[PDB]
Amino acid sequence: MSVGREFVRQYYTLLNKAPNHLHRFYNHNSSYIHGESKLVVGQREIHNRIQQLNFNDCHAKISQVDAQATLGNGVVVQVTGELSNDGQPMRRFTQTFVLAAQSPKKYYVHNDIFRYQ
Amino acid sequence: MSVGREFVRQYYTLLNKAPNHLHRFYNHNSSYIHGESKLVVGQREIHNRIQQLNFNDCHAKISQVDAQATLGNGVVVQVTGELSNDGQPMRRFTQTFVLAAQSPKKYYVHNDIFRYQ
């Protein structure tokens, strides 16, 4: 759906504006992978991973977005683009999202896999 | 789970050996996106979609694989690597898979998003 395309904009807006509040997109059973670190589950710990990742003025140039309906009436999103942290050069990245439709139009990030290329 | 890593090997082995049989990984409710075309749904539609893509001696060099348990006891997989069709230069690609457990260790590809960089 178009929901995925809207969420990505929200995700990186919040990644840029306030990284320490990005964890509120997740719930107690959310899986998280960033870079190549170990898998992380829960609203906590994910908050701690992002914390030690230390995002500061993180700009994102989104190149490609594709969203599909998936299991449990969820939405699977693939995001391709470039990321910059602390003014460092833009690295090509790839992110896979699984959005869990926690009732009406209230979603939670069930899966987050971020990977630099 | 490690199941994802196994499937990626199977998917690209079969993409190399018998592309016209790759559709047997999907079913009546599978979603397929390759390149930048429209969303394709259904094993029969995925079949002739691959058919017109014409994979001939397709080599794949996988860089990174990450799998996570997802909604409805599924597995979300992100594959990063390089693809080559008909001896053309290796293009960087990115793929998102959602594997749906039929009942035992028998999986169907519920989601397939392929995208070049």
Q: Tell me if chain A has a CB within 8 Å of the CB of B113.
A: yes
Position A72: which residue type? Answer: G
B78: nearest CB among A70, A92, A115: A115
The number of distinct structural domains making up chain B is 1
Q: How was this structure determined?
A: X-ray
Is the Cβ of A71 closer than 8 Å to some Cβ of chain B? Answer: yes
How many CB atoms sit inside 10 A of residue A52's CB? 7
Amino acid at A51: Q
Residue A72 CB coordination number (10 Å): 13
Are A65 and A4 in contact by the 8 Å Cβ rule? The answer is yes
* CB-closest option in A36, A63, A70 to B71: A70
**Cα–Cα distance for residue pair A88/B88, rounded to 1 Å:** 33
User: B74–A69: do the CB atoms touch at under 8 Å?
Assistant: no
Q: What is the CATH number of the domain that holds B93?
A: 3.10.450.50
Parent domain of B75: 1-117
Phi, psi of A90 (to 5 degrees): -65, 115
In 3D space, the residue among A24, A33, A51 whose CA is nearest the CA of residue B69 turns out to be A33
Spatial neighbors of B97 by CB under 8 A, at least 6 apart, are B4, B7, B8, B11, B75, B76, B77, B78, B79, B109, B111, B112
To one decimal place, what's the resolution in Å?
Answer: 2.7
**How close B82 comes to chain A (CA, Å)?**
11
Interior/surface letters B59-80, b for 16+ CB within 10 angstroms, e for the rest: ebebeebbbbbbbeebbbbbbb
Burial class, A55, CB count within 10 angstroms (exposed 0-12 / middle 13-18 / buried 19+): middle
Our measurement of the distance from residue B67's CA atom to the centroid of its chain's CA atoms, rounded to an integer in Å, reads: 14
- For A78, the closest of B39, B74, B94 (CB atoms) is B94
Query: Does A92 contact B at CB distance below 8 Å?
Result: yes
| A39 contact residues in B (CB cutoff 8 A) | 68
- Closest partner CB to B71 (pick from A63, A71, A78): A71
